[PDB]
Design a protein around this nucleic acid. Structure first.
Ligand SMILES: [K+]
Ligand SMILES: [K+]
Ligand SMILES: [Mg+2]
Ligand SMILES: [Mg+2]
Length: 135
RNA sequence: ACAU
DNA sequence: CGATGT
């Protein structure tokens, strides 16, 4: 079981959980940063991981790329498979923004198709995912 | 327990 | 140490 180097890797970074959430996607082989989401004032780690995968799906579809996506998040990979983010985060004014983004990401999954493999990054064998924030 |  | 998740 070896790394698929021709892939996109995503990760979340946060200040608090729940807290400020950002995410980015990188070329697994080179580390080149391909997209970075503006920090969201309040969210959860798993909402960020979910949004990062869905943004990766949208990024690769727009560019007609068949590359797989690596995520280290068991939770987010399942949420994407399910097309349903089962977050416990309260819905209030402070969490409105991230919940809007999560709702819209689910909506995108329910109205689009993709063949993109979404693969578990095996941190125990390979070290930190290439998109890691190092926090 | 596993993944963050 | 605490929080998010299956
Ligand atoms: K980190
Ligand atoms: K736990
Ligand atoms: Mg991660
Ligand atoms: Mg990380």
């Amino acid at each position: 079981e070896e790394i698929i180097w021709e892939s996109l890797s995503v990760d979340v970074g946060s200040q608090g959980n729940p807290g400020i959430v950002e995410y980015k996607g990188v070329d697994t082989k080179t580390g080149e940063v391909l997209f970075e989401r503006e920090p969201i004032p309040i969210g959860t780690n798993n909402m960020g991981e979910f949004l990062a995968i869905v943004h990766g799906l949208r990024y690769l579809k727009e560019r007609n790329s068949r590359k797989p996506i690596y995520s280290d998040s068991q939770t987010a990979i399942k949420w994407v498979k399910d097309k349903k983010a089962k977050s416990t985060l309260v819905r209030n004014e402070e969490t409105a923004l991230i919940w809007k983004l999560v709702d819209e990401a689910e909506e995108w999954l329910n109205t689009h198709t993709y063949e993109t493999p979404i693969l578990k990054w095996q941190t125990d064998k390979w070290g930190e995912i290439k998109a890691d924030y190092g926090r």
